[PDB]
């Protein structure tokens, strides 16, 4: 029916208007989801960096022993060098010093 057909087309157009309106409502509502869901990502970022930070803090303790051993070997070499140098020259400094004090 011509009136029936025109009404059919108008009802279909109303259906299409409803469809586009539903899509627009989805967009508008999902904007708030965009605002909110960012909390998940920022929390995951925080947790990742905290894990890495704590791992670094717990693992950084090792180098202290190696540094201590290295520097202690170095000082041992220096002290042995000074001790040898003294033992070489000690006698004549003593004899001079006593000669002058007497």
């Amino acid at each position: 029916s011509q009136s029936q057909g025109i009404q059919q087309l108008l009802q279909a157009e109303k259906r299409a208007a409803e469809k586009v309106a539903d899509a627009r409502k989805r967009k508008a509502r999902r904007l708030k989801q965009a605002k909110e869901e960012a909390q998940m990502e920022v929390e995951q970022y925080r947790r990742e960096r905290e894990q890495e930070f704590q791992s670094k803090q717990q693992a950084a303790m090792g180098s202290q022993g190696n540094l201590s051993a290295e520097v202690e070997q170095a000082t041992r070499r220096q002290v042995q060098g000074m001790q040898s140098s003294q033992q070489r020259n000690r006698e004549r400094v003593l004899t001079q010093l006593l000669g002058m004090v007497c």
């Binding site: 011509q2 057909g5 025109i6 087309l9 108008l10 157009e13």
Partner: protein, 336 residues
């Protein structure tokens, strides 16, 4: 045997389809939106531009008649392209109008300058002729002017000069053979070139205003024969340059107008049909009720199938997958 009918047809294919109808001519549309006046309807914008395009053509057509150029007659009746070929036609006619108007204005101004410079040339030549009793010196109280007058005004003009600046101004006159065209009045009239000598500022003003009142033209003039030769040579070259430019621009006008007359009739038919088609789609229902156009029509019964066939062509030409649909309806309104 006549019957109403109504067509559902997608907007995209609707233009082409109504075009196929217009060619067919067995359909009579009717207004389906009388509530709003014609001067407000949807497609009015388009129709307005269509009208403007028509105006452009008329103007060009008019110049075509103004010149001697003829107007062709092929017999083809192409249809306005439903796609926005309007932009291309608008650009084409915008050019075929703006070029013609710029050519007309430049032609006018350059004709004026050419005529003024020809007058200056004649004045210089004749003043050189007058300064040829015995010019023993190669080169300031005396004030000197010169210009050109319409012949047969020499008697009245001379009388007025000798009557205002009484017995204290000298005027020499010489006919200009091969009469010239008026700078503004635009008529071939005889002219006399005249040189006026006068004593001081007051008489200078007297004669200047007298000549201006006698609708004469003065222009400058040389003070020394060196200056005379210099400016005469300059003007003689500038006149020839202007003659060349005028001939070339007139050739340009002739060429573009010829091109216009080659397609002016087809342009008129295209734009006229396009105007009619958009004005008809004004008569049909619009998106205020549905994205698909609604048409109402009187047709004789027997042509219905043909109309549908014609509709089919539109679909194919429009490339729209959806077809347009033709429906009858029992009715009360009076058949024509």
């Amino acid at each position: 045997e006549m019957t109403l009918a109504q067509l559902f047809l997608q907007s995209e294919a609707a233009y082409c389809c109504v075009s196929e109808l217009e060619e067919l001519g067995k359909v009579q549309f009717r207004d389906l939106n009388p509530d709003v006046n014609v001067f407000q309807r949807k497609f009015v914008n388009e129709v307005r531009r269509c009208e403007e395009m028509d105006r452009k053509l008329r103007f060009v057509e008019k110049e075509i008649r103004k010149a001697n150029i003829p107007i062709m007659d092929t017999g083809e009746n192409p249809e306005v392209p439903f796609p926005r070929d309007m932009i291309d036609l608008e650009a084409n006619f915008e050019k075929i109008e703006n070029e013609l108007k710029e050519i007309n204005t430049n032609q006018e101004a350059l004709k004026r300058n050419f005529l003024e410079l020809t007058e200056l040339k004649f004045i210089l030549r004749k003043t050189q002729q007058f300064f040829d009793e015995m010019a023993d010196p190669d080169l300031l109280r005396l004030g000197f002017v010169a210009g050109v007058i319409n012949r047969e005004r020499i008697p009245t003009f001379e009388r007025m000069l000798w009557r205002v600046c009484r017995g204290n101004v000298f005027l020499r006159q010489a006919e200009i053979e091969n009469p010239l065209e008026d700078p503004v009045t635009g008529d071939y009239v005889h002219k006399s070139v005249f040189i006026i000598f006068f004593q001081g500022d007051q008489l200078k003003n007297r004669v200047k205003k007298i000549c201006e009142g006698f609708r004469a033209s003065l222009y400058p003039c040389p003070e020394t024969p060196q200056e005379r030769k210099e400016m005469a040579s300059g003007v003689n070259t500038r006149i020839d340059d202007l003659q060349m430019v005028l001939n070339q621009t007139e050739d340009h006008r002739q060429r573009v107008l010829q091109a216009a007359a080659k397609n002016i009739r087809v342009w008129f038919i295209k734009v006229r049909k396009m105007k009619a088609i958009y004005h008809t789609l004004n008569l049909c229902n619009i998106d205020v009720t549905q994205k698909c156009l609604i048409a109402e029509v009187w047709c004789p019964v027997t042509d219905l199938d043909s109309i549908q066939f014609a509709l089919r062509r539109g679909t194919e030409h429009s490339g729209s997958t959806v077809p347009s649909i033709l429906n009858r309806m029992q009715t009360n309104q009076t058949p024509p």
